Write a protein that binds this ligand. Structure first.
Ligand SMILES: [Mg+2]
Ligand SMILES: [Mg+2]
Ligand SMILES: [Mg+2]
Ligand SMILES: [Mg+2]
Lengths: 22, 558, 567, 139
């Protein structure tokens, strides 16, 4: 018989940066 | 069991279309040959859940004596060496060999995902086999397939191409009249009291669709049954007879039902019921009348704009200094407007993942438009609409993309399915200029600092459920409290109540202390003049003068 | 005797309304079918149980299974799925057919969240097939035949919207935190079989319990019993052979065991964010009599005296903000409130709550305030509000206005679409001019208490509080110290005391050194203070003091247009 | 190898690690060499990917537990040692973090002598001058 399979690989996240107005 | 055309309600145009499509090529093939057109082979159905699509399919299966064969999307696959192909093949073989039958596949999205989106090998086989058999069932073989999908965007376009599935039928949601007949259909098999007037019931039922009306009816019946069971002492051992013929659902049951129910679409974002009424907001009367008129006129007097051929203004933005009942007005409309209401806090939508944020904005706006009419309350607009600038502190313009998506999905508003956007910001200067468009949040309401009579209204409306002295005049405080915001008056009254509580509990445990070694439980059953004087001796102002100056300048701009 | 342990409707308690709703829904269509044919409409045959963990959902289901005489079939969530392709749907089909055919039956779907997430957020295949098959089973042709489906969840928002429509799950019951009477009832049911001494007072225990739900109460009882066992297993030996019959009886878990277990345990929600119980008492905080009495007055009555508030029909005052020069003792007052007051305490630092990811600060704030209102009544201490409350728009260059979104989130969360039953925010800031204008508004933080530099009698009170445990010289008088210190703060007096202790310990260890070479000092002497106050300074300078007094007098000027105000 | 072990599929990276360890203990007393663990064992606190948490937990468990190891030794190599969870950097997992810095001019002499031990060359060239002018090179 042919079996099934579950799969969950990854995603994409977002970072936040700080700047200085010299 | 016994469901027919009488059972179906609303969607008369769609019902007539489906009736033609399913009867004419099956009861009159000779007429189709005579006119000279090959009758269609496939029809798909889509729309929000609970619109009676499956009910309609059962009615079509029953009314027409043609042989029927039910298949459900997720029920055609198997395990033994991919017998799913054999299952579908044998289904089609039985449908042809038995009679000029009719085949109905429900929830095709379960058995027809986009090729790229589904990963695996058995899915490819079943989808391709569905394609080839749907092609091979020729026109002269007198069978037709009916497709019923809850979500139309979950199917690859290859199944939608002309010649396999050409006729679409957007069932959608019913109108007020459609809701009226649905109520009549549902209530024609129960003992209804005389005082029921379904026209009003359809005037207030707004976001309910198809099945929710049945829920309302059944739950109302339950309310009547419980109201009449406790009074009669219906013992668990006994059976009552004389009560049976007297049970009748009253109007108050339906009022209870409408007050405690929610359209299934809005079930996710339901907020717990917090009582607010238009009499509690004493001040800002002109704003109250303007808001009620502008929000109710499209919902009760449509004909005026149709004769005028104009689109009444939709958006509005509240701005003003802190604590002047803006959120209170939002609560009041949410409670006593006779329309749906979805409030969202600014920061809830943002998230760390990529894309989900705007997807959530799409979800909320889709939900708002589906159960139209609705009133979207945007509190703290100073969180989403920020001056983009060249600051570059954004995460790749994530805020910028979110605001642009909100602009694109709120500016594509239609006169049909009216959704009223309520704005509320504390600092009006940091919102983008794009929000003042006539087609987007046009109205600009300013909530000013209250005056003497407004302040008196605030006090008397805020202490309605409050025991007071008989000989007390509130004009003096109004003359004294000049720049005092409503929240500050709340502070004053709460402090006075606190002093009253202090005196009450002091007298209480005092009297008890002499007791150990009924009368008046509270020797001070209401606040008193000296309590108010002591609460007012330590009162403060809420808003400084700089905020008043800057808001006055902002108002002076227009 | 499994019959004895079987839990009826009597066992479940504190949620009599939901109990009645479920009991009628399950029995009336199976006890008075003629009545339901007479009314005209059919009953609902789908219900969704939801609520926080440890409320009684599974217990409620067990009671229903024990009481109702119909067939009962149970389906755990993940149990259906199997590796081979297309068996889960087979499991659902066989379950449903056997349940329906074999007399009228009750389905219970435990942890539905494992099955129906959203139909569009998942990316697998088998799960979408299980949800579609479930939808078909709920509604279609011959959808159900005298069968009703119950589901239980802790996060109902992760459920497919199609499941929350009439015909699939008609009614949603909300089994939330029990009230004082509810917790009293659950305590009574859980203590009906153990042996109690007469001294026990369950009413008081329900009174001081503020957020415990169900299993929390059970845990309290169990641990108390264990403590009693560890109190009466100390007089008796191990006795591994067997236990004598004179000790097994007359155990009697007394009320102090309950008090001890309540003082140790915390609600099941708060244990994630439990803080150590720093030991402080009201006698430790010298001076500031009006501030301590005001705090006690505003915190203990709304939580203990709701009848009067209902009588007058006004909501209580919620917020409070301490502000003043550093070291006057605001954080000390917070410590006292945290340790002595019965209400729950959530200690959070100022910038502790920020986070690297985008929007996760706002999620963290939402989680903390939802947690606070979940186990209410609670008091939340926001130390150094000037870290979190910046004047909006002042920072052109920033991380995308993350501070602005944070402060706006706080503003809406402390005042929004919330019942606002019992949440007390305490503010403590050493730079009160930089706080956002809206935070100082009444209705959010209405009480601005200035803690000025202590007066001579207040410095004397502080000194008496700070030497309440140290052994002291009989002939030593603090009045000279008070008369001599004028501009000092409480921290400075603590510094003087610590210096005196330092000289005392130095002399003690030296004298012990000579003693061993071949307790001399019973207490601190006068000369230790004479030499310990020669290195004394003032912490806050005149500039900061003039700033704080200017702020206070600006508020007092804002207090204008007040007079005798005769009525 | 560093990144070879990790797999997108659920429960394969840890499966590979388990297979490697069991065969290594089965065959004979042996030495393992997990190079660039930093690509296998990042900070659990700062990571979001579930598979890295899974592999680091599996490594922690197998390296120390109930009768974890029996006459086996393991060696790790990283280019930076800070980006690893502390639980790995205690006794019983990685005892002593021995450093290996840039070679000295002497070390340049020995490495050149090793390199030239089999390559025929002119006699004029001198190794010490080459090492002195080869400053900054490594390995
Ligand atoms: Mg259907
Ligand atoms: Mg507001
Ligand atoms: Mg449970
Ligand atoms: Mg402090």
């Amino acid at each position: 018989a042919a079996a099934a399979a579950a799969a969950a690989a990854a995603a994409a996240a977002v970072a936040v940066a700080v700047a200085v107005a010299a | 069991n016994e469901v027919g055309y009488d059972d179906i309600g609303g969607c008369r145009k769609q019902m007539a279309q489906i009736r033609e499509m399913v009867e004419l090529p099956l009861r009159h093939p000779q007429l189709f040959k005579a006119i000279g057109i090959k009758p269609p082979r496939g029809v798909l159905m889509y729309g929000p859940p609970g619109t009676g699509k499956t009910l309609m399919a059962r009615a079509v299966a029953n009314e027409t004596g043609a042989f029927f064969f039910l298949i459900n999307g997720p029920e055609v696959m198997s395990k033994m060496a991919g017998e799913s192909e054999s299952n579908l093949r044998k289904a089609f073989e039985e449908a042809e060999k038995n009679a000029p039958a009719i085949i109905f596949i429900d929830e095709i999205d379960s058995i027809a995902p986009k090729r790229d989106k589904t990963n695996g090998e058995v899915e490819r086989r079943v989808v391709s086999q569905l394609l080839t058999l749907m092609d091979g069932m020729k026109a002269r073989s007198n069978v037709v397939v009916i497709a019923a999908t809850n979500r139309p965007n979950s199917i690859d376009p290859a199944l939608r191409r002309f010649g396999r599935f050409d006729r679409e039928v957007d069932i959608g949601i019913p109108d007020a009249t459609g809701r009226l007949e649905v109520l009549r259909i549902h209530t024609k098999n129960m003992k209804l009291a005389d005082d029921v007037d379904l026209e009003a019931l359809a005037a207030e039922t707004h976001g309910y669709v198809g099945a929710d009306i049945a829920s309302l009816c059944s739950e109302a019946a339950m309310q009547q049954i419980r109201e009449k069971m406790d009074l009669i002492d219906l013992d668990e051992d006994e059976i009552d007879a004389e009560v049976l013929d007297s049970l009748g659902v009253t109007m108050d049951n339906f009022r209870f039902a409408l007050g405690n129910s929610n359209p299934s679409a809005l079930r996710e974002t339901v907020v717990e019921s917090v009582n607010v009424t238009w009499d509690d907001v004493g001040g800002l009367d002109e704003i109250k009348e303007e808001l009620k008129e502008t929000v109710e006129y499209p919902v009760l007097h449509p004909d005026q704009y149709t004769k005028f051929g104009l689109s009444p203004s939709k958006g509005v933005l509240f701005y003003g200094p802190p604590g002047t009942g803006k959120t209170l007005l939002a609560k009041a409309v949410a409670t006593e407007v006779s329309a749906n209401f979805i409030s969202v806090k600014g920061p809830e939508l943002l998230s760390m993942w990529y894309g989900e944020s705007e997807s959530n904005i799409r979800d909320i706006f889709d939900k708002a438009r589906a159960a139209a009419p609705t009133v979207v309350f945007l509190d703290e607009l100073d969180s989403i609409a920020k001056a983009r600038g060249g600051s570059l502190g954004d995460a790749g313009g994530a805020s910028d993309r979110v605001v642009n998506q909100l602009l694109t999905e709120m500016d594509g508003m239609n006169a049909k399915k009216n959704v009223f956007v309520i704005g509320a910001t504390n600092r009006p200067d940091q919102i983008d200029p794009a929000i003042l468009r006539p087609g987007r949040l046009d109205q600009l309401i300013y909530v000013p600092l209250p005056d003497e009579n407004a302040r008196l209204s605030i006090l008397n409306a805020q202490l309605r459920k409050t025991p007071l002295e008989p000989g007390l005049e509130l004009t003096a405080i109004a003359k004294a409290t000049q720049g005092f915001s409503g929240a500050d008056l709340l502070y004053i009254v709460q402090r006075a109540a606190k002093y009253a509580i202090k005196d009450s509990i002091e007298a209480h445990r005092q009297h008890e202390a002499e007791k150990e070694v009924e009368p008046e439980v509270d020797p001070v059953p209401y606040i008193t003049k000296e309590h108010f004087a002591e609460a007012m001796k330590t009162a403060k102002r809420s808003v400084s003068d700089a905020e008043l100056r800057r808001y006055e300048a902002y108002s002076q701009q227009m």
